[PDB]
Amino acid sequence: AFFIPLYELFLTYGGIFRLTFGPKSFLIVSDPSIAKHILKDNAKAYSKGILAEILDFVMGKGLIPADGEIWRRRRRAIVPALHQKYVAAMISLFGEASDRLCQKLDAAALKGEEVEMESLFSRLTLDIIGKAVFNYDFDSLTNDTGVIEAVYTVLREAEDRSVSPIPVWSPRQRKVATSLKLINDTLDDLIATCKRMVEEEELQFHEEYMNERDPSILHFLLASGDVSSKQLRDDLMTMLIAGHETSAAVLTWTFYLLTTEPSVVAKLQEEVDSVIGDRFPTIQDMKKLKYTTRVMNESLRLYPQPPVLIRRSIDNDILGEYPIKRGEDIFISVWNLHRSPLHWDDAEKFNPERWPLDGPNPNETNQNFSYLPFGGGPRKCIGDMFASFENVVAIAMLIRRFNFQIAPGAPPVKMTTGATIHTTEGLKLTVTKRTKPLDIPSVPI
């Protein structure tokens, strides 16, 4: 909840102030022009600062905590893997995995059982990202394994390291090392298997390269003639963490928000029934699911993942009107930017159509850095199309099949400090079926 007090301090003291706690301090930036200066116009004057001390233990030299030449080299190598053909193929994976979740919800609906949606969404996004990135099937939606428990142990340690530098106003360290070893060994097995597959395949590599039997990013990188084993594992681990935690929270907060506005749910149900019905969405459906897209856009506005971006000055600069030297630890409050009453009409209202339904999708450019769901400038998210489609698919397929409501007596929904916005106790919902089992599958065109 660290960003919550920063909001009211922003209202009183403005778009840049120094939050001091004893002999240390952070600069808190909530001004879109200043954010644009740091993230895009003058990014060369900034490092990821504290972000690296948080994530280094698991991401190593991966893209998110990296800076300098190793960042530039790996960025140029990895971005080509997320080409249009790859993203189009991942939409099939999104639908298959979302359908496996629907089967779980359908079983609960038939028994009248309530469901805790945050944990289910975490399993869904873990299953998707493991397959998309390095061709592994966690199947966390169905089972628990030592590999799955290792990932969540590592995730929890990353959460602990995120809260550690933040002011408030062994045996675990051995379990972490064991979990890291199991995941690294697991990745090593996949890398070895994939190299064998690359050596035996007959496919000329091109800019749209994709082996249809193994379309993972790991396979693209290996067939491209890419670096060391440590570096490749770090690259994969970074994308695993990034693509799991973010969308798990986006889906959680999207369905929380849906319970707050029945008229939005009605309009969403109308679109999904009309556009996809019971179908697995395709790439063509991504442009037609316009209201679903806006619901996702508005969820990311109200609950950004992460709610803050972290930088450190490595040179002199000017922020707003204020000169700074190198060494300033800076938190850009995406939360404040997204909820600023100066730049948003009825900023606290869940209103998917605050951007025209038939107009351009909102991004950091056309919102002039008052909206930054995927960051901006050279360090902008590389999975932004991937994740946007992933969440549209999950939302649409679930809303097609079920009605969701806050469960009676459910624990309150409150936020926590972390890399992403988790709830305190989950999102406990009742789930009822919208369609009949004996109805013929409906395929609209």
Ligand X SMILES: CC1=C(/C=C/C(C)=C/C=C/C(C)=C/C=O)C(C)(C)CCC1
Contacts to ligand HEM by CB under 6 A: 63-64, 75, 238-239, 242-243, 246-247, 250, 305, 309, 373-375, 379, 381-383, 386-387
| 166 is an interface residue for ligand X by CB under 6 A | yes
CB 326 within 8 A of CB 362: no
Could you report how far apart the first and last alpha carbons of the chain are, in Å? 45
CB 409 within 8 A of CB 403: no
Q: Which of ligand HEM, ligand X, none does residue 382 bind (CB under 5 to 8 Å by kind)?
A: ligand HEM
Q: SS3 for 220?
A: helix
Question: Which residue number, 7 or 280, has a Cβ lying nearer to ligand X?
Answer: 7
How remote is the C-alpha of 312 from its chain's centroid? 23
Q: Other C-beta atoms within 10 Å of 1: how many?
A: 14
| 253 is an interface residue for ligand X by CB under 6 A | no
Phi and psi (nearest 5°) for 441? -55, 130
CA-to-CA distance for 292 and 287, rounded, in angstroms? Answer: 10
Both tokens of 53, joined, read 């001390």
Both tokens of 307, joined, read 């709610």
CA-to-CA distance for 374 and 18, rounded, in angstroms? Answer: 25
Residues 6+ apart with CB under 8 A from 34: 15, 16, 319, 320
Hey, which residues between 264 and 293 contact ligand X (CB under 6 A)? none
Q: How far is the CB of 225 from ligand X (least distance, A)?
A: 28
Which range binds ligand X by CB under 6 A, 8-16, 255-263, 398-406, 412-420? 412-420
Question: Which residue number, 6 or 109, has a Cβ lying nearer to ligand HEM?
Answer: 6
CB 154 within 8 A of CB 57: no
CB 115 within 8 A of CB 429: yes
Hey, which residues between 230 and 249 contact ligand X (CB under 6 A)? 241-242, 245-246
CB 102 within 8 A of CB 401: yes
| Residue 22, Ramachandran bin (φ over 0: left; ψ between -120 and 50: alpha; else beta) | left
| 25 is an interface residue for ligand X by CB under 6 A | no
Question: Which residue number, 247 or 370, has a Cβ lying nearer to ligand HEM?
Answer: 247
Q: Which of ligand HEM, ligand X, none does residue 247 bind (CB under 5 to 8 Å by kind)?
A: ligand HEM
Tokens 């107009």 -> residue: 359
CA-to-CA distance for 424 and 217, rounded, in angstroms? Answer: 34
| 2 is an interface residue for ligand X by CB under 6 A | yes
| 27 is an interface residue for ligand X by CB under 6 A | no
- Residue 194 annotated as part of some ligand binding site: no
Q: Which of ligand X, ligand HEM, none does residue 410 bind (CB under 5 to 8 Å by kind)?
A: none
Q: How far is the CB of 162 from ligand X (least distance, A)?
A: 4
Q: How far is the CB of 155 from ligand X (least distance, A)?
A: 9
Residue of 109, 133, 141, 308 that binds ligand X (CB under 6 A):
308
Strand order from edge to edge, sheet including 428-433: 115-116, 428-433, 402-406
Which range binds ligand X by CB under 6 A, 107-115, 295-303, 305-313, 348-356? 305-313
Question: Which residue number, 42 or 417, has a Cβ lying nearer to ligand X?
Answer: 417
Helices (H), 60-145: 68-78, 84-111, 117-134
Hey, which residues between 143 and 162 contact ligand X (CB under 6 A)? 162
Q: Which of ligand HEM, ligand X, none does residue 244 bind (CB under 5 to 8 Å by kind)?
A: none
| 406 is an interface residue for ligand X by CB under 6 A | no
Residue of 98, 293, 420, 423 that binds ligand X (CB under 6 A):
420
Q: Which of ligand X, ligand HEM, none does residue 34 bind (CB under 5 to 8 Å by kind)?
A: none
Residue ranges of the binding site for heme: 381
Residue ranges of the binding site: 381
Contact residues for ligand X (CB under 6 A)?
2-3, 51, 54-55, 64, 162, 166, 241-242, 245-246, 305-306, 308, 417, 419-420
